[PDB]
Design an enzyme around this catalytic site. Structure first.
Site, PDB file in Angstrom:
ATOM      1  N   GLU A  54      -0.081   4.837   5.326  1.00  0.00           N
ATOM      2  CA  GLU A  54      -0.237   3.935   4.179  1.00  0.00           C
ATOM      3  C   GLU A  54      -1.450   3.020   4.323  1.00  0.00           C
ATOM      4  OE1 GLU A  54       3.042   1.220   3.512  1.00  0.00           O
ATOM      5  OE2 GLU A  54       2.322   0.611   1.558  1.00  0.00           O
ATOM      6  N   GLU A  79      -3.887  -7.632   5.644  1.00  0.00           N
ATOM      7  CA  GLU A  79      -2.825  -7.128   6.520  1.00  0.00           C
ATOM      8  C   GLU A  79      -3.402  -6.351   7.700  1.00  0.00           C
ATOM      9  OE1 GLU A  79       0.667  -5.630   4.746  1.00  0.00           O
ATOM     10  OE2 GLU A  79       0.657  -7.157   3.171  1.00  0.00           O
ATOM     11  N   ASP A 115       0.012   2.701  -2.252  1.00  0.00           N
ATOM     12  CA  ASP A 115       0.800   1.557  -2.720  1.00  0.00           C
ATOM     13  C   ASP A 115      -0.010   0.821  -3.783  1.00  0.00           C
ATOM     14  OD1 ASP A 115       1.435  -1.379  -2.799  1.00  0.00           O
ATOM     15  OD2 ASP A 115       2.978  -0.873  -1.364  1.00  0.00           O
ATOM     16  N   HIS A 135      -1.458  -2.755  -2.898  1.00  0.00           N
ATOM     17  CA  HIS A 135      -2.610  -2.646  -1.991  1.00  0.00           C
ATOM     18  C   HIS A 135      -3.827  -1.990  -2.659  1.00  0.00           C
ATOM     19  CE1 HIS A 135      -0.424  -4.276   1.342  1.00  0.00           C
ATOM     20  NE2 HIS A 135       0.576  -3.438   1.116  1.00  0.00           N
ATOM     21  N   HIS A 178       4.390   3.988  -3.366  1.00  0.00           N
ATOM     22  CA  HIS A 178       4.993   2.655  -3.445  1.00  0.00           C
ATOM     23  C   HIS A 178       4.518   1.954  -4.701  1.00  0.00           C
ATOM     24  CE1 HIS A 178       6.261   1.552   0.976  1.00  0.00           C
ATOM     25  NE2 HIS A 178       7.095   2.392   0.391  1.00  0.00           N
ATOM     26  N   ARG A 187       2.754  -8.329  -6.571  1.00  0.00           N
ATOM     27  CA  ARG A 187       3.821  -7.706  -5.769  1.00  0.00           C
ATOM     28  C   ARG A 187       5.219  -8.011  -6.324  1.00  0.00           C
ATOM     29  NH1 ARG A 187       2.969  -6.548   0.799  1.00  0.00           N
ATOM     30  NH2 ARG A 187       3.620  -4.348   0.577  1.00  0.00           N
ATOM     31  N   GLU A 221       8.788  -1.143  -3.947  1.00  0.00           N
ATOM     32  CA  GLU A 221       8.670  -2.004  -2.782  1.00  0.00           C
ATOM     33  C   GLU A 221       8.064  -3.315  -3.240  1.00  0.00           C
ATOM     34  OE1 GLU A 221       5.477  -1.960  -0.050  1.00  0.00           O
ATOM     35  OE2 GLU A 221       6.727  -1.108   1.536  1.00  0.00           O
TER      36      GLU A 221
HETATM   37 CU    CU Z   1       4.067  -0.354   0.533  1.00  0.00          CU
END
Ligand code: CU
Ligand code: CU
Lengths: 269, 268
Positions: free
Chosen positions: A149, A155, A182, A185, A208, A214, A243
């Site tokens: 991922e 991060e 995702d 991201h 995701h 988010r 998520e």
């Molecule tokens: Cu994720």
């Protein structure tokens, strides 16, 4: 395409009752809302009774489609690229335990933050170490499937884009490793998200979703419409897994809002 | 799955030059024939310059996949179930040194004859002693991986079948211990070899091949076809190591014949 819900669980170390409680509540929620599977994340699978988890999955007719490994890094400091080869070994050993659990459920194993960061090193060395660890994991497992991922710059500084991941996949050269993209991201790191997903193509194994903040899909400003048109174009037929933060209004409300947003995108497609 | 060759080497404590010579010749043979790795066997590892071995492995692009330990028993009388606790301790310490060597190469450590025999005791007493020694090994080593090899009745009265090995693995309860199955030994002790291999499943960590007469695969009457069909069906992606008598016609001819036989069954 199928819809899955990521369920947050307490570490079982710690509070074995809380883990079980969190899991059942989350799985019952997913089933009631209409999700077809759940996704979990555990730090160390050695402290969980997975025979009981399997019974719960069977009772609710709810498969576990993926297992996250990130807390192995965040809590235990384990990294597949750690400069200390002793910790690299321990990281590989931990992830093998995740694959043992994944085998019970036919689940994907997610390689997120457990891959580790550059830690002052060249991208090249970090990448070499990572490829070596993934090749070891493939030598150590007969059935496990992994997804890498890409994550945003805050991060990690290692694998931030789908292209970063595709380059690594070509070096690993195994169909047992694919990509987990995702949308939260990608909203930061990808230039053109539909183009990025077309480049991934068959290598996109898991997906995701969360909005730009988010929150539950539908509660930010991310363009899911273009993404789902592209997923249809590349023939994506695996899981779309929610998520997100438990916002707005908590874990139950967020899961319901997310489901409604995604279902409308999918059915009109 | 990958092909490896077991190569025989002199004991270095007796002639270190002959060990190096045997090793080089064996590894050059393996590479020439087309094996992807080699497997060796040493009585006492603390007597050898393993740093030089690593260079040779690196220079030939030829990994060492497994280290055999059986001569520690046959020659030195060291047993992980020895009734004499001092000797049992020395056996454990010897195998720890084997794991240090294996660690350099990412190799497996084979627990074959070094586990010892019943020697007049009950199966149960012998088994609990074994389990104790294995748990001690797991404590004393951090990353080492062991493979228990069931052996036929004439070589030992302790762990003769895959099912017995599986039962003991459950009691040890560590993924750092698995099974090494050998076709020559299975030909005597297993009722149905494909069914035995399926029961082993992911716990089958390593594999030895030799024909029914222990000659090069293809030179007896063992059904390798059904074995390899089963290994493919269970997704075996580890090593298949040739461990046979230097027959027919010597070590080199045996290695050539075995490779030809096995490569054919692997590609098809
Ligand atoms: Cu994720
Ligand atoms: Cu053997």
């Amino acid at each position: 395409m199928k819809l899955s819900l990521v369920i947050s669980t307490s570490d079982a170390a710690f509070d074995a009752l809380a883990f079980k409680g969190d899991l059942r509540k989350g799985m019952e929620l997913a089933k009631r809302v209409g999700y077809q599977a759940v996704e979990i994340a555990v730090r160390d699978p050695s402290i969980v009774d997975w025979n009981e988890v399997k019974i719960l999955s069977e009772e609710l007719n709810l498969p576990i489609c993926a297992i996250g490994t990130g807390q192995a890094y965040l809590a235990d400091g384990l990294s597949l690229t750690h400069p200390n080869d002793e910790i690299r070994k321990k990281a590989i050993e931990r992830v093998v335990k995740h694959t043992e659990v994944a085998g019970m459920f036919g689940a994907l194993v997610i390689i997120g933050l457990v891959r580790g960061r550059r830690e002052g090193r060249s991208y090249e060395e970090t990448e070499e170490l990572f490829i070596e660890s993934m090749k070891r994991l493939l030598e150590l497992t007969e059935h496990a499937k992994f997804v890498i991922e890409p994550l945003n710059r805050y991060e990690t500084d290692f694998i931030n884009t789908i292209d970063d991941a595709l380059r690594i996949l070509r070096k690993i050269n195994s169909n047992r490793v694919g990509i987990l993209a995702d949308t939260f991201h990608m909203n930061i790191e990808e230039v053109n998200i539909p183009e990025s997903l077309k480049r991934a193509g068959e290598k996109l194994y898991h997906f995701h979703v969360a909005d730009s903040n988010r929150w539950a899909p539908g509660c930010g400003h991310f363009d899911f419409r273009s993404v789902f048109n592209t997923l249809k174009e590349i023939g994506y037929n695996r899981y779309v897994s929610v998520e997100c933060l438990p916002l707005p209004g908590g874990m139950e409300e967020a899961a319901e809002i997310a489901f409604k947003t995604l279902k409308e995108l999918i059915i009109k497609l």
